[PDB]
Amino acid sequence: TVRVRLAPSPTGNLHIGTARTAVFNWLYARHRGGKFILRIEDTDRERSRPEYTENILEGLQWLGLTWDEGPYFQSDRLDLYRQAIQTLLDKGLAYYCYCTPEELEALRAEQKAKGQAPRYDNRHRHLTPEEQAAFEAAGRTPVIRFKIEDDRQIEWQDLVRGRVSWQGADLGGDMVIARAAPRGEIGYPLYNLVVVVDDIAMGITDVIRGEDHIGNTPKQILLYEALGATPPNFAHTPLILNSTGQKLSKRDGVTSISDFRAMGYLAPALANYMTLLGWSPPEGVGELFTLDLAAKHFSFERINKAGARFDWDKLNWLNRQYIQQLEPEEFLAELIPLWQGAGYAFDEERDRPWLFDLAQLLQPGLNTLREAIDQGAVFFIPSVTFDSEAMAQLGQPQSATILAYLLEHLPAEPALTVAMGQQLIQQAAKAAGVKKGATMRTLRAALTGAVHGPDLMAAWQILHQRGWDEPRLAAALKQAQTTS
């Protein structure tokens, strides 16, 4: 049974990168009929707080990225890391390093000057009780380093990358596995230690990771061996790239799942999208798929082996498709607080029939749910200001005649049929001596303040239910007349 896991640190909100990894995990586990484990790497850090854990779970659930196990919290497991490290010290596979950061910096500078590989020189591997005690009496307290063999050939068959090969000397020397603490105490366990201890304990069969952390892989492989475990398979995916081709920056633009959600993007659209960022679907599947369908066909072979540029136009293309999948009643419900938030005056209960009609109208051409604000303005703001084209349209010689006909022949009854509407345009045109196009264009100007926009008959139907076509036609007629 395949076992995979998401291991986010709640140091910030759920970002697209992490969620993308979660998608690949959920997709791979589901494909292989395995388990998806969620592990929260909650650290003593200033950054780690319960509001980011909250945001992580919320976003995963919302994206439909259901875990089968957890969340298992790192902070409950502290002693397991302590045990693992103590086992390493006892075995002499780890040791106390008393080398200060100022000492490391001088080493590193002396390395650059000499054209030597940048690394810790393993200077404290074999310290004498006397040497340790000298450091301690000067008030030093040691970190704990895990021994890495310089000449060790580390290799793995990566599920995305292929054979990946590292020398032991390429890992930067004996790595710190625990932060400073006095001898007899063990400090805060570092990432590479924690992840192997937990991956071994959680029985993880396959680790899915961003390629930006590929260098931890040979380090972790050595920890598994030292702890007597066989490492799992690794799959290193390329990161999501910019709109142009550099790193997607957390400090530049929108990356968090909660922000995309806030913007009017739907969960299934986000899911479908993140998948498309790196995974190209097989012939016959297409670009519009659920997670359940993506699971039937998911494989690491088909992962685009370089960065997927993030494209707003494609996210929008998908979101439009999901918005259209929304039931008219659910869809309207999504819109109401949006319109409410804009300060638009209406009553959910009283104004329902045309509100619904407005939803029906606006649905087919929204890229985000937020687009219903500006696209609804003409139906919620009473007065219309005429644009440069509307003003020139009403300035046409027969505009007054058209409008006055329309105004005089509007039905009192609340529902305007498409039949009654076409009758009116046809008859207003006949009165003015003009073609239907110019008539509609004059009606458009009157009702919207523009010469182009949403389906006119439907816009008029909506505005008629409000009783708003009547004062608008009157305002346009008065406008036509001021030119005359």
Ligand SMILES: N[C@@H](CCC(=O)O)C(=O)O
């Ligand atoms: N947070 C990193 C490393 C955690 C891990 O999967 O071990 C990533 O997923 O790219």
